[PDB]
Symmetry: C3
Subunit: 288 residues, 3 copies
Amino acid sequence: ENGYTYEDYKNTAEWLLSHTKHRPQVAIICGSGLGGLTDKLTQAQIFDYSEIPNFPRSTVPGHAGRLVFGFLNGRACVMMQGRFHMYEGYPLWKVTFPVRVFHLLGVDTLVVTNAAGGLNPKFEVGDIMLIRDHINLPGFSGQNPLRGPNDERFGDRFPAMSDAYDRTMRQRALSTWKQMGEQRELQEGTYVMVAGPSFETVAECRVLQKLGADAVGMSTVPEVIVARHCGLRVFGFSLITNKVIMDYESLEKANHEEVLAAGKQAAQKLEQFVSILMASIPLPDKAS
Amino acid sequence: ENGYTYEDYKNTAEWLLSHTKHRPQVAIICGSGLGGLTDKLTQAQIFDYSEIPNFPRSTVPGHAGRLVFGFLNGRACVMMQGRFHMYEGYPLWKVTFPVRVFHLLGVDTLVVTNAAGGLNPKFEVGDIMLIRDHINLPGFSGQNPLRGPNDERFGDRFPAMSDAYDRTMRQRALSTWKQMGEQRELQEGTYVMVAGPSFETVAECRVLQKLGADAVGMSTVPEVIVARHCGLRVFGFSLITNKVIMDYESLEKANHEEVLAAGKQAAQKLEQFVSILMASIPLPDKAS
Amino acid sequence: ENGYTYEDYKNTAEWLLSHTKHRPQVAIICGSGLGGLTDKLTQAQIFDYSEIPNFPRSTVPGHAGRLVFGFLNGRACVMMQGRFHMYEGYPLWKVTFPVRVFHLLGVDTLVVTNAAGGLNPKFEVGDIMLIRDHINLPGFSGQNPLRGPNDERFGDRFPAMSDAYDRTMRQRALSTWKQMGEQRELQEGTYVMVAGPSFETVAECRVLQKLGADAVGMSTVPEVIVARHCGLRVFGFSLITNKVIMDYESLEKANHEEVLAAGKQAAQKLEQFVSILMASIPLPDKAS
Ligand SMILES: O=c1[nH]c(S)nc2ccccc12
Ligand SMILES: O=c1[nH]c(S)nc2ccccc12
Ligand SMILES: O=c1[nH]c(S)nc2ccccc12
């Protein structure tokens, strides 16, 4: 919703339609250190958010800040390099905003990736984690990317989220992760979106655990509301870039932008995984 | 508080005093599918929120959006058909706003009803649930209908809420529910206000349970702050319109606007119950 | 962040530098009933927030609302009598605002005190509680005193908070509390910041307990983000002004502004403790 009207969104989609060859079927929104995946694109047309009629511009490089329309491995993708976070200041209905254009672009599946701090002890930096559910810690509070009036043009007043994350694709994903036989396990997990940008304290971590969450992070669960709200099929992963300290002790263990190949090998691990998974995305037309 | 001054509230009360025969003693605010209760009114004078000097207008029918002043079964009621939710966009101090007029109207008791998703497993669609306590999930965050400066004219800076929901009336209520010997049990329960409008995911439901809540819903706990803050006697019920899925499995069970007589029989069940309860509301004057 | 630019902060620091003899090393921000500690100051220069270029002014006495620059027991202090709360209406980046001036003033340690409702049953009104960690219940939601863009001039985009509260000083503190051999124990504890001003209901209290918190209160955990974000050394205490009712029963037990010497003896207890602790604050220069 707010700040944007439906025309804004059309205008934005329209400009993008009438400015690119591409009709993307799949949107991907990359988390930090996963932008690299925009390389896998072919016949990339890049846009600076900038140029796009309503798109939030980022907050300064920025140049981690682009929309690249692509072919990833089958599918007509549009990818977002440099997602918006509420910790940066927009509100949700600027985070969730590409998502609503993506739809209008005719996108029907959204994949989201992100980096999260693993809370689940069975979890190791480098791990990918396939999002099964989420906890919307800002949602509970007001902060849900649908707050204000509802545009029946996009969705229902009270979309369900019990099924945000596709059984089918989590199925397919989990298959695939084995089909290529791997490294460690493809984890699966509730991701807690915590806003807002200090990292947690121990007591806080402890809470997110007892609350039940496996990966804590800070994007997703707004793209996902606006996505499921729209009807997109959603799935995604968190790269565990950190084992979240659960526990009292000294100068210790964190974070994402400071591991060797446990940033950039894991990043590519997820990136290829994602690229492969394109193959499981149901082609659109009904299409068998 | 915000956006409204005390004069606004007087002006609104004043206009309503000087525009209606009625001096209501009791305000009732109905939840979805309980507006029907405004039928039980007699010598109904209806107002569109619309006409009333400051009242938030709703967000579009709207025509589920009225203030009907009534006699319910003893008492001089003013009832609200179409409560405001923060998921729609106002802030609390527009939800909580009728409540502060109601006081100024000389109302001294507020009854609130709503539809909530039952979290407590011992709970069944159709169930009424008498609110014993609440958890103010947006309150913890900022979002409390008293945030900003306090008008000692209405209440204290730091009202207590441990006693939001009258022992007396929960007593009386619970009596009465037996006095007419019933169907199922009159349940009792913490209602968690969760903002913000997608329904929860499973993980989320799980959290509200371990958090201790029985009914999850999305109004009340702002009317109740502003009410107790004002001194009104508050009590209320949730119609369980849903057994909240606690648990992983397929295309399943939800929601309120889609049960047969487990919408409209339960609605009337609560509505009569409410009408009867008028009888337990202490008449005002000290009055024995 | 928001609403303020970096110049504002300099201007404010600059005006205060160029308007006072003092260069404070330590900032102290007092909680209710601990303002008295500004008496221990010597060569007090008082400022009304008022006079200070950007400082939020309070919301009305107000006259519990001053910045007194002092010498407490060694150290060059600047103290804040009448902290801002978000329940009053500013946003965090007006609570957290003195803190950022304090830095710019060259302050490098911040001590925060407050009154909290004890949740931990092993806890008794009068108790001081040394803050070991916090739970940032509004932080999880959006409400973190760093939300919006980050000024690398003050800190990192993603400051850690696992170490908000100094091991060293909690060490020193805990030493000292024994060194003067005492009354009861110096407690230690997670403080939950809950926003937002009604007191909790029982169900709510129950939640903050299972969430793990010992003292619930309503300031600190924003000064602390902006402080650690800045690099200040932070530590502090909560005066337990209340044993938070955990439990269902009648007209019972609360609150802070209504105990005899379990307001004002405890206040002085904490105040001296604080004054003594000045002695443990590492002098600044590297300084051995
Ligand atoms: O290690 C982390 N803790 C938290 S709260 N959020 C994160 C987001 C991305 C990477 C790591 C983290
Ligand atoms: O079934 C429900 N889940 C949630 S979160 N809120 C509700 C509000 C009204 C009716 C049902 C529900
Ligand atoms: O007794 C209290 N409960 C809560 S929620 N907050 C407080 C803050 C200061 C003093 C007491 C309290």
